[PDB]
Amino acid sequence: EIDTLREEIDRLDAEILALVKRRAEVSKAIGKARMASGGPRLVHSREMKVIERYSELGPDGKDLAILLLRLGRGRL
Amino acid sequence: EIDTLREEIDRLDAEILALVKRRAEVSKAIGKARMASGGPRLVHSREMKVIERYSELGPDGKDLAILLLRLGRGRL
Numbered sequence: 242e243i244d245t246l247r248e249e250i251d252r253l254d255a256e257i258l259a260l261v262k263r264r265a266e267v268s269k270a271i272g273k274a275r276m277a278s279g280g281p282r283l284v285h286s287r288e289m290k291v292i293e294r295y296s297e298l299g300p301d302g303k304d305l306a307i308l309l310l311r312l313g314r315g316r317l
Numbered sequence: 318e319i320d321t322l323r324e325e326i327d328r329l330d331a332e333i334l335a336l337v338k339r340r341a342e343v344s345k346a347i348g349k350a351r352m353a354s355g356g357p358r359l360v361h362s363r364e365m366k367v368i369e370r371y372s373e374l375g376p377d378g379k380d381l382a383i384l385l386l387r388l389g390r391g392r393l
Contacts, residue, residue: 246347247363253340254370254385257333261374261381264329271322287323294330298337301387305337308384309330311377 261312268313276315337388344389352391 275282282288288310295306351358358364364386371382 243347243350246343246350249343250340250347250367253336253343254367257336257340257385258370258373260329260333260336261371264326264333265374267322267325267329271319271326274319274322291326291330294334295337297334298341298388301384305381305384305388308377308381309333312374312381 261309264309265312268310269315272313272315337385340385341388344386345391348389348391 291310292303292306295302295309298305367386368379368382371378371385374381
């Protein structure tokens with residue numbers, strides 16, 4: 242029944258938004274700790290593994306991982 | 318400490334991936350029920366509200382909502 246399915250979607254989006262906001266805050270912290278310690282960014286090791294993880298969803302999955310990594314970027 | 322922050326990221330991504338997979342399955346169902354009942358797609362009402370919800374994250378947020386809606390599209 243559509244309305245039950247719709248309310249399942251709204252529950253899923255509440256959970257996703259909360260987790261993405263937290264992921265953005267944690268990534269920002271990791272960024273601070275990288276810059277405040279030098280050392281290269283882990284693009285080809287760790288970031289590529291994150292993109293591969295979400296690639297299980299298909300190519301819109303790869304793009305989703307790319308946006309999550311953008312959300313973790315430092316602001317002045 | 319980086320390694321603790323890194324393990325928090327990996328926990329957050331496990332949760333996000335599980336919820337996105339479920340959201341894809343539920344959206345597909347809503348799609349089936351729409352087609353199998355006619356009626357217009359709720360682009361300007363419901364989909365726009367989902368994009369607005371994720372827009373709280375910034376423009377990468379708008380793009381994230383667009384990809385979540387794509388993941389819900391029917392396959393033969």
